[PDB]
Ligand binder design. Structure first.
Ligand SMILES: Cc1cc2nc3c(=O)[nH]c(=O)nc-3n(C[C@H](O)[C@H](O)[C@H](O)COP(=O)(O)O)c2cc1C
Ligand code: SF4
Ligand code: FES
Ligand code: NA
Lengths: 416, 156
């Protein structure tokens, strides 16, 4: 028995990452094995670590955590440095609108565990971690049980399947900070400290957990690793566009008929995600904007863009929050400002004071209590959260809000 | 003078022995303490620091940093209400109004019996099921006051 989880709708056109996770229930090891589960691990243990890295590289798989670094290349960088090495599964998923990772953790934990074992073997890590946000208690108990199921079927522990490879997967819990998804802050939290990002360089692949070479990968990235080994890199590269190949999970929310997670190729357009798959809008109202998580804002004129990591593409993590004609953009921008205000770790002064002031002044603007000085101050602060910042949060805290100012000036001017 | 009840001490020692290094268990221990008492008693920090082999200052800093931990209000059930973008768009205010009609409390408040506390939180990452809330570890989609009332009646 696990804590209650809402039943998120999940649909797939590829039947890969959502093969089992399209069903809202825990798929235990017996059901997993019946589908050919852990057979990719068996094949991997018969291959050299260098060969697995090459396949993952040739698959063109890129990070699903937001930065899109090529996964195979990240592994090459880490194995350049001497051991012991560490493998970390980033299950901190806390960005507004993003709920793709949890459905893998909660419904197909073994797809994630298998991915972790293959990845750990590829980089020579004998100790792996799952760092899962504190607000996923069910996901935590499901992973602990699944790890024990894997241990009993001999997929974990010492000398896994007579290969001489040892691995233990430890599950760590977060405790309320979005910043703990930042790979260096996650490592600090795993070391039993406050989740404060470290100045980069050094990068985790060189000096991470206990100053040792550390590979941090997102849940969704790791969930592709069993498919790459099972299918082979070539067959995997055939899925979707050849330049942005493989399956991709799209968490869709807001004013859509069918909100949920969609497994689609990355040549799908934003308009197709909304209208062809998510069933269009609630009450057939006009789409006003799409928020790419708390990162970007796309207008109704930008829906024909592809859902890939190209510069003109959707980018981010494929997070789709739909706002229709009746949704106030200034009220929406305030919710984004409030997010960054609550999440800055405060190490950097323009980030600490800029995230606070952007939200404080925007609330004044929204409530009709802003002076002309507050209006000018708001514009200044929004353009000045980034200076001296040592992590991605300070660099993006004003991005989406700046885009609503540029794309919806008529709406903002109504608040003047 | 402060002592952890044996049943808690045992669970705490298990977390401390779980990771390769003792100090890595700090967050698991603090979740355990809060689940046992319904908050983090200020007096529990010194015995925990000793067990983790960390200075009291380090533990206090960690408790202050992580938002899930509450050192002030003892509450049997924590009602975490998402106040972020998607739940806002889909009905956070309807959820809060329903909670006030049922329990008589607003965000940050605790009922007179110490049973329920409304905690406003950022995105719980169940956005397709907005407006979202948790009741301790259980997570739900808010539908209506009638539906919410039935959910809350399960926490006695
Ligand atoms: C403020 C901030 C929050 C982040 N949150 C997450 C998160 O919840 N999950 C995640 O996997 N990556 C998150 N990232 C990105 C990670 O730092 C990192 O790029 C990623 O985990 C690497 O894995 P990938 O290459 O598989 O994408 C965040 C980054 C920043 C700057
Ligand atoms: S940029 Fe912001 S969130 Fe990142 S380390 Fe600096 S203060 Fe913390
Ligand atoms: S915005 Fe409420 S759960 Fe994501
Ligand atoms: Na966290």
């Amino acid at each position: 028995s696990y804590p209650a989880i809402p039943r998120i709708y999940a649909e797939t056109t590829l039947n890969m990452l959502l093969k089992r996770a399209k069903k809202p229930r825990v798929h235990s090891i017996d059901e997993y094995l019946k589908d050919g589960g852990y057979q990719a691990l068996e094949k991997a243990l018969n291959m050299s670590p260098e060969e697995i890295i090459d396949w993952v590289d040739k698959s063109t798989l890129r990070g699903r955590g937001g930065a899109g670094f090529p996964t195979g290349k990240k592994w090459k960088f880490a194995v350049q440095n001497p051991g012991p090495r560490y493998f970390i599964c980033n299950a901190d998923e806390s960005e507004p609108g993003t709920f793709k990772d949890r459905i893998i953790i909660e419904r197909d934990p073994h797809l994630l565990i298998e991915g972790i074992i293959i990845s750990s073997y590829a980089i020579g890590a004998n100790e792996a971690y799952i760092y899962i946000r504190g607000e996923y208690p069910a996901g935590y108990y499901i992973l602990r049980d699944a790890i024990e199921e894997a241990k009993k079927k001999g997929f974990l522990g010492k000398n896994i399947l007579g290969s001489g490879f040892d691995l233990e997967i430890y599950v760590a819990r977060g405790a309320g900070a979005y910043i703990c998804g930042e790979e260096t802050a996650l490592i600090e939290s795993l070391e039993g400290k406050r989740g404060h990002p470290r100045l980069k360089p050094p990068y985790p692949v060189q000096k991470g957990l206990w100053g040792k070479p550390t590979v941090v990968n997102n849940v969704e990235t790791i969930a592709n690793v069993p498919f790459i080994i099972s299918m082979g890199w070539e067959e995997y590269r055939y899925i979707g566009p050849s330049d942005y190949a493989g399956p991709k999970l799209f968490p869709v929310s807001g004013k859509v008929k069918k909100p949920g997670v969609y497994e689609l190729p990355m040549n799908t357009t934003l308009r197709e995600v909304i209208f062809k798959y998510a069933g269009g809008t609630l009450g057939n109202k006009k789409v006003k904007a799409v928020f790419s998580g708390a990162l970007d804002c796309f207008s109704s004129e930008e829906l024909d863009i592809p859902m890939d990591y190209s510069p003109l593409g959707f980018g981010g993590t494929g997070t789709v929050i739909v706002l229709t004609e009746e949704d106030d953009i200034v009220e929406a921008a305030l919710k984004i400002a409030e997010f960054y205000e609550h999440e800055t770790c405060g190490q950097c002064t323009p980030c600490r004071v800029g995230c606070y002031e952007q939200a404080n002044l925007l609330e004044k603007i929204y409530k009709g209590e802003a002076t002309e000085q507050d209006w000018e101050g708001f514009d200044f602060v929004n353009r000045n959260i980034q200076p001296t910042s040592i992590c991605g949060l300070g660099a993006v805290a004003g991005r989406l809000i700046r885009q609503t100012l540029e794309k919806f000036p008529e709406e903002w001017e109504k608040y003047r | 003078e402060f002592e952890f009840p044996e049943e808690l001490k045992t669970k705490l020692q298990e977390h401390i022995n779980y990771f390769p290094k003792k100090r890595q268990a700090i967050l698991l221990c603090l979740h355990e303490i809060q689940n046992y008492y319904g908050y983090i008693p200020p007096e529990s920090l010194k015995p925990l620091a000793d067990m983790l082999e960390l200075p009291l200052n380090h533990v206090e800093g960690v408790v202050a940093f992580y938002d899930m931990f509450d050192r002030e209000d003892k509450a049997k059930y924590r009602i975490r209400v998402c106040v972020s973008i998607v739940c806002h768009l889909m009905g956070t205010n309807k959820l809060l109004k329903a909670l006030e009609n049922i329990l008589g409390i607003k965000p940050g408040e605790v009922t007179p019996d110490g049973k329920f506390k409304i905690v406003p939180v950022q995105c719980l990452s169940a956005c397709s099921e907005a407006p979202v809330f948790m009741v301790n570890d259980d997570e739900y989609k808010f539908e209506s006051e009638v539906q919410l009332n039935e959910i809350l009646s399960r926490y006695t």
